[PDB]
């Protein structure tokens, strides 16, 4: 039906173009007997959120519906879930974080050295700095997601 269409290419409009039955129509057309379908569907549904009242609350009720359904499902592994979410959201795995920090330790002590040396063109002092300033270098991605989450875990 419209629900299967919607899924394929989610969209605020595709979502609102289902009236109030959308919420319950998706949690029902979704097999909560193996968290991979619930994750992939919990994601498809929220990949639509936009600040706007309509699309916002649309999404909420649509998810409170898919979550109950699966929280009363025995075959539902709540654990494998949270766990499969955090990965396809980069909050878990994504990179050998330790090893990385490990490869920086040295290069970061040398580069942090050069800069302070006399034999360093006064030119780059402001190039380098105004360089780890562009968003692709300053904007921190999941370490932000992670915090927004904690914020709520402690609730407020």
């Amino acid at each position: 039906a419209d629900v299967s269409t919607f899924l394929a290419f989610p969209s605020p409009e595709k979502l609102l173009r289902l009236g109030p039955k959308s919420s319950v129509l998706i949690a029902q057309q979704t097999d909560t007997s193996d968290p991979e379908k619930v994750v992939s569907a919990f994601l498809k549904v929220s990949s639509v959120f936009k600040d706007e009242a309509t699309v916002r609350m649309a999404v909420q009720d649509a998810v409170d519906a898919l979550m109950q359904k699966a929280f009363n499902s025995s075959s539902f592994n709540s654990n494998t879930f949270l766990t499969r979410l955090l990965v396809h959201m980069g909050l878990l795995k994504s990179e050998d974080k330790v090893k990385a920090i490990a490869n920086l330790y040295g290069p970061l002590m040398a580069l942090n050295h050069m800069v302070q040396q006399d034999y360093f063109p006064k030119a780059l002092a402001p190039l380098l700095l105004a360089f780890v300033t562009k968003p692709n270098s300053a904007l921190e991605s999941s370490s932000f997601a992670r915090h927004s989450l904690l914020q709520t875990l402690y609730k407020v």
């Binding site: 394929a8 290419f9 989610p10 498809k44 692709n136």
Partner: protein, 74 residues
């Protein structure tokens, strides 16, 4: 006909001649999870469309299409 992926996949078929492949792709989107905004089809290079037809773009028996994950850079 077939739909060779990037990963090292190789899923094969057949379909109606002057048939609208608009449905040969929404299906295989579900059949892989791959949402289309993330992937793109390309036959021998030329991006296939909804409204095109295996018949039209003249592909024959054992003809392989290709799917790529959307790329970006900067």
């Amino acid at each position: 006909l077939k739909v060779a992926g990037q990963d090292g996949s190789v899923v094969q078929f057949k379909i109606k001649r002057h048939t609208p492949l608009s449905k040969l792709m929404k299906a295989y989107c579900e059949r892989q999870g791959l949402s289309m905004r993330q992937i793109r089809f390309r036959f021998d290079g030329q991006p296939i469309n909804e409204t095109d037809t295996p018949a039209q773009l003249e592909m024959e028996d054992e003809d392989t299409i290709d799917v790529f994950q959307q790329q970006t850079g900067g």
